Write a protein that binds this ligand. Structure first.
Ligand SMILES: *Cc1c(COP(=O)(O)O)cnc(C)c1O
Ligand SMILES: *Cc1c(COP(=O)(O)O)cnc(C)c1O
Lengths: 405, 405
């Protein structure tokens, strides 16, 4: 940076604080990652100065010749990476990606089937305080009370009874592989559309380490950030027959002018995802997640579903008589960043919780391998089993600093 | 840039093309502007790596200490600049800013009164192909057929007959000052809320060159870009009593995690707007718009409302038997960027139009004064009155290059 330190010292000081914070702490929030320096440079570009209302070739304003190339590059790389027939890279967020699809297929008050929020489902999948649960009639399917894997018979039963117009699959906190083939099999039985929100698993789908939902779902939504390691934003993937309708749901549907500088960064992020080292990176993420899972059990922690198939894991803290809130607070004191998260059939409210959510996507970007996975797990054990001891927390504090150089 | 040229040559080449395009052309689209190098650096920051779901102090995740400072700086500067009691700087766009307010005050199918789209109103003010016109029952008020100024008696008549729950004031293409006091007087009579969408005039409100809608409106929405010369995004301003409800309409209402790097740039943009030279800049914008308006009439062009009170003007092209589409196309050939725009009571469809929309915000940033306003107007006259002559267009092409160095 050059012009910000001089122009706005207060803002630059806070950014430099945040930059050092990202280095000093161990980032274990499953939705967090670190983007490349090339991705950031694209967001700091002059492409913010251009209104590009519409789509490449079909713009409502002139002078879009080169931002069209950018959006095309973003759309073509997305289709190459995921094997989709159509792509829309204009969604401002994953929430706006979901909103647009809902706007396409559903009318106000329509019944939609989604994953239980206490079981793994996202806010945009039918929360009574979110637009989705207010705009539409949302019903829930759950996971098995003891195996914590999606009960696909329950998904079929809920679909056949509630007769939804849409079925949403995918989660914010689900450690296992989602069977999209069985979701389509259920959707075809009740004559409903299928939408997959791969936001958390998108990078793992790109590297072929998680089954691709594209050939099963009518609509596929995702965030460009998280495991895809791209800028903060959204994307919609669909078959050719929904292409025009999905585009119209973004503009002039729910949005105005797109963020061309962010779309530029999406194109950079997709280009980086197509390369071989990203597929090697994403394998290490899952390898690190499996290693962390095994090591936490070795420390005496119960895990939701008894492990992980993807990038994230949930710790059932009830054995140690701890709440997610307590765990989040105490780990923040040593430099480990987690978020409290409801476990399936949680006795505690969503604001207190009985579990914590941990992902390996961010730390794996920093170069964390199998060795440090065991150390992170050792520190978490030291902290949570010795909450009252400041001796342990100071020891843990030093062991966090040893890992982060 | 350093890492993008090496990482993604295709994307960097298109960005460099766009950077040179922004320099080479004369940007006269009223919604366009050029942000400072400090604003861009804030968007190219690591603040994209942080999830900040919630609000400063009341976050759903830890490690937000410094992004809270950023959001607070953005919120406090906004309140200083506009005299508002509360600010929300999380809206991804002006469209999402409007959407959130509608989500707060209205239930599905509620009657809303807004400005006619053919008269100046925005897409988000009740288009039957936009969410606003589908989600809500939108009725329209118009301008005077010969004066092109808002018919405030028509606004009262439409309000008393249709009994709206909300009244929206402000426009995308309205060259005159909007009387917010009379809009509130009408809203109080019918017991309706008042919302002002100052997106186009926000910078002029900041410099005190346009009446502030804050003490008249219950809700004030705006884009952070355009005349405010900030990053691409949205903002909501309201009184203290709506603060909690407006915040809940953004999250967990219509959005997820905010764009902290864009909020950082908003804070930079507001900081730049509080300084004296911005108030001097914004006066030159209006001065340039008045000078361009007078000069275009001197060339024989009819203007909507017979001039301008703000940053933008509309040319009624019917005298020269030209459509907006034809004018937009031919000016693109010489290097002048405009957009076709429906004039009030336009015989031509919104896709062909009878007028063009011109703003001075962008060129004034580049250093354009009164002298070059007369030259721009001279070139526009040369082009549009000699459409068939390539001799004139080549002459015009050279005169565009003389202005842009
Ligand atoms: C992260 C996520 C989203 C969207 O997040 P934004 O903050 O809106 O980008 C949507 N659905 C799921 C399942 C997610 O994980
Ligand atoms: C520009 C504008 C908006 C929003 O534009 P976005 O592209 O959504 O940022 C909303 N209302 C009015 C009147 C505008 O001019």
């Amino acid at each position: 940076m050059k012009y910000l330190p001089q122009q706005d010292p207060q803002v630059f000081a806070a950014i430099e604080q945040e930059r050092k914070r990202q280095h000093a702490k161990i980032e274990l929030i499953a939705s967090e990652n670190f983007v490349s320096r090339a991705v950031m440079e694209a967001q700091g570009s002059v492409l913010t100065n251009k209104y590009a209302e519409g789509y490449p070739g079909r713009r409502y304003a002139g002078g879009c010749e080169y931002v069209d190339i950018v959006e095309e590059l973003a759309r073509e790389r997305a289709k190459q990476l995921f094997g989709a027939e159509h792509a829309n890279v204009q969604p401002h967020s994953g929430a706006q990606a979901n909103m647009a699809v809902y706007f396409t297929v559903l009318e106000h008050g329509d019944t939609v089937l989604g994953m239980n929020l206490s079981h793994g489902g996202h806010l945009t999948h039918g929360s009574p305080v979110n637009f989705s649960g207010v705009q539409y009639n949302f019903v829930a399917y759950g996971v098995d009370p003891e195996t914590h894997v999606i009960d696909y018979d329950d998904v079929r039963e809920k679909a056949r009874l509630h007769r939804p117009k849409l079925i949403v699959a995918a989660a914010s906190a689900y450690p296992r592989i989602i069977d999209f083939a069985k979701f389509r099999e259920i959707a075809d039985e009740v004559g409903a559309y299928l939408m997959v929100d791969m936001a958390h698993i998108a990078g793992l789908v790109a590297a072929g380490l998680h089954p691709n939902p594209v050939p099963y779902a009518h609509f596929v939504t995702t965030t460009t950030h998280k495991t895809l390691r791209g800028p903060r934003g959204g994307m919609i993937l669909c078959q050719e027959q929904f292409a025009k309708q999905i585009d119209k749901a973004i503009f002039p549907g729910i949005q105005g002018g797109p963020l061309m500088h962010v779309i530029a960064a999406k194109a950079v992020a997709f280009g980086e995802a197509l390369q071989d080292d990203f597929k090697a990176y994403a394998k290490r993420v899952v390898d690190n997640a499996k290693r962390l899972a095994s090591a936490l059990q070795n420390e005496g922690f119960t895990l939701v579903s008894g492990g992980t198939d993807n990038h994230l894991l949930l710790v059932d803290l009830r054995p140690q008589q701890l709440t997610g809130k307590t765990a989040e607070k105490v780990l923040d004191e040593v430099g480990i960043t987690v978020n409290k998260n409801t476990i399936p059939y949680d006795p505690e409210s969503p604001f207190v919780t009985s579990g914590i959510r941990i992902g390996t996507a961010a730390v794996t970007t920093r170069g964390f391998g199998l060795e440090e996975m065991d150390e992170i797990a050792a520190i978490i054990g030291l902290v949570l089993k010795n909450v009252g001891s400041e001796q342990a927390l100071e020891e843990a504090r030093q062991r966090v600093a040893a890992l982060t150089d």
